[PDB]
Amino acid sequence: MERKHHFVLVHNACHGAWIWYKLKPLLESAGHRVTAVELAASGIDPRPIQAVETVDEYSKPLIETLKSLPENEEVILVGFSFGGINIALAADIFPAKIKVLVFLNAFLPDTTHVPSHVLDKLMEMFGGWGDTEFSSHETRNGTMSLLKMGPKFMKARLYQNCPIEDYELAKMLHRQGSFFTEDLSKKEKFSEEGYGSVQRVYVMSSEDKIIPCDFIRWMIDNFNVSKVYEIDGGDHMVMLSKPQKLFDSLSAIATDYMG
Amino acid sequence: MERKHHFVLVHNACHGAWIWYKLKPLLESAGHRVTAVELAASGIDPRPIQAVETVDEYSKPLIETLKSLPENEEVILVGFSFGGINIALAADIFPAKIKVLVFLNAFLPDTTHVPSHVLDKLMEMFGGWGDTEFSSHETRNGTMSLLKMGPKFMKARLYQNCPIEDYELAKMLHRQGSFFTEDLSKKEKFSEEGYGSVQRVYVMSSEDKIIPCDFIRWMIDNFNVSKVYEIDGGDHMVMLSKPQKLFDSLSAIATDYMG
Numbered sequence: 001m002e003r004k005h006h007f008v009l010v011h012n013a014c015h016g017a018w019i020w021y022k023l024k025p026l027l028e029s030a031g032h033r034v035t036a037v038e039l040a041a042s043g044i045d046p047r048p049i050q051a052v053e054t055v056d057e058y059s060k061p062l063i064e065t066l067k068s069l070p071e072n073e074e075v076i077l078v079g080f081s082f083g084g085i086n087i088a089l090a091a092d093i094f095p096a097k098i099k100v101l102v103f104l105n106a107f108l109p110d111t112t113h114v115p116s117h118v119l120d121k122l123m124e125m126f127g128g129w130g131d132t133e134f135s136s137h138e139t140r141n142g143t144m145s146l147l148k149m150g151p152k153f154m155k156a157r158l159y160q161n162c163p164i165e166d167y168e169l170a171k172m173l174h175r176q177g178s179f180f181t182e183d184l185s186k187k188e189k190f191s192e193e194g195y196g197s198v199q200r201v202y203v204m205s206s207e208d209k210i211i212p213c214d215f216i217r218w219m220i221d222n223f224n225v226s227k228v229y230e231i232d233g234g235d236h237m238v239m240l241s242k243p244q245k246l247f248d249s250l251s252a253i254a255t256d257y258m259g
Numbered sequence: 260m261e262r263k264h265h266f267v268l269v270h271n272a273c274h275g276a277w278i279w280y281k282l283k284p285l286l287e288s289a290g291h292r293v294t295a296v297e298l299a300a301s302g303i304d305p306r307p308i309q310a311v312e313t314v315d316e317y318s319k320p321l322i323e324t325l326k327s328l329p330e331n332e333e334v335i336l337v338g339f340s341f342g343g344i345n346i347a348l349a350a351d352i353f354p355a356k357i358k359v360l361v362f363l364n365a366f367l368p369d370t371t372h373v374p375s376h377v378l379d380k381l382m383e384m385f386g387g388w389g390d391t392e393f394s395s396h397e398t399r400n401g402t403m404s405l406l407k408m409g410p411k412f413m414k415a416r417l418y419q420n421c422p423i424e425d426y427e428l429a430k431m432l433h434r435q436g437s438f439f440t441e442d443l444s445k446k447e448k449f450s451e452e453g454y455g456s457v458q459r460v461y462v463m464s465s466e467d468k469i470i471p472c473d474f475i476r477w478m479i480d481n482f483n484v485s486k487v488y489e490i491d492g493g494d495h496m497v498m499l500s501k502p503q504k505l506f507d508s509l510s511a512i513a514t515d516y517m518g
């Protein structure tokens with residue numbers, strides 16, 4: 001038969017590995033292996049976000065997973081939202097362990113501006129945070145900006161096409177997090193030899209109210225991808241609102257990287 | 260249109276508030292109110308179980324939920340598995356805040372033997388722990404026994420009638436826990452004037468492979484209930500395998516304590 005892949009799934013800020021609970025079994029039933037990474041201070045990780053002061057600390061469970069893969073094994077690496085930044089850091093360290101990067105309703109950084117550039121661009125134009133709570137934590141690495149989503153903001157901007165059950169689950173599991181924008185703006189730019197040499201594709205939702213089309217076309221313009229895929233009717237949490245259609249996009253990506 | 264009630268939902272050891280993610284919108288969409296408590300060192304709670312040495316510290320978030328209710332409000336308090344022990348401790352403190360106790364596939368303690376008695380009896384009787392990992396932690400006041408479920412034991416004994424998604428979700432969220440057996444052996448008997456005075460019913464799953472049919476009959480013989488309800492086809496995690504039939508049971512119980 002056709003050969004399968006190992007997908008490594010990377011969640012977004014304020015969430016954890018649990019968001020993949022629908023997608024993981026569809027991928028395994030089709031014969032693939034799946035590793036749902038849990039980032040620092042996310043999900044049931046024992047650290048509060050105040051103890052994770054840098055984006056390198058945040059990403060470390062991703063680096064470790066790639067480090068421990070046996071030699072010559074390559075993965076399909078999927079990053080969701082802020083997970084786009086994580087997957088790019090990983091790519092600049094272990095480029096040869098990644099078959100293709102999958103930017104899913106994700107931030108897509110480039111190899112020319114500071115790594116915060118696409119975050120900073122969006123933050124300027126963003127619109128309405130609603131009942132979200134902002135705060136600060138002072139560290140030996142400077143001031144960290146934290147946020148915790150409000151439930152009305154979740155309902156209107158992230159979960160608007162999701163079953164009520166998934167909305168209620170997200171309320172019981174989401175945590176205070178950070179986009180690490182200060183730390184990212186001080187970081188060495190992503191390299192051309194690393195991150196820049198890896199294959200990459202972009203999967204977008206049509207009804208994402210966080211990352212508008214508008215903005216995606218701009219990120220892709222600054223930094224091209226091989227291919228773009230579209231999930232009709234998906235909200236931002238597309239693995240919860242349309243998991244079957246996300247499965248179909250990921251199979252088709254798998255089939256293009258058989259070689 | 261009848262009186263609606265307020266349901267306080269209390270999860271089992273090694274799990275969290277998340278388990279109620281299907282049941283909560285069923286109850287709310289029929290007019291009821293629902294608070295799903297998260298216990299110490301459970302779900303996304305920032306503490307490890309090592310730091311919660313006693314079943315009073317473990318139960319504190321439940322106790323704070325009842326204390327914050329307005330004057331004269333009463334709840335239907337639902338306690339799943341080890342949550343049966345939690346709801347008993349609460350009923351000994353605030354008997355007048357509880358319309359009825361609902362022991363759902365739960366440990367039902369009595370007012371004659373020490374509070375650890377139904378737990379010690381099950382532990383002598385159960386032969387299918389599987390890949391579950393047991394350990395000790397030494398506190399300033401004695402040994403604290405701990406456990407962490409293994410995935411094969413989860414699938415065989417707790418989740419065997421659940422959709423594969425819900426078993427994947429549990430594997431991403433379950434944590435090391437404790438039954439506090441040593442602490443409960445040292446604790447004073449539950450009282451007649453408090454816990455004993457409160458109305459109680461038992462709701463049981465017809466295919467529970469962890470709390471078997473016979474053990475239930477034994478527990479109810481040490482300590483009578485007003486009424487027993489059965490859910491046909493339920494596994495132990497019946498709010499995940501048969502949420503609509505668990506909804507039907509809890510509406511029937513709300514109809515008997517209408518007022």
Ligand SMILES: N#C[C@H](O)c1ccccc1
Nearest residue numbers: 012013014081082083149
């Ligand atoms: N990264 C990421 C998430 O999609 C996210 C989390 C909180 C607020 C906006 C967006």
Ligand SMILES: N#C[C@H](O)c1ccccc1
Nearest residue numbers: 271272273340341342408
């Ligand atoms: N309490 C409780 C849970 O149902 C439970 C947790 C771990 C192992 C067996 C049973």
Ligand SMILES: O=Cc1ccccc1
Nearest residue numbers: 082119122123126179
């Ligand atoms: O505004 C920045 C931003 C970053 C991540 C998710 C949503 C917004």
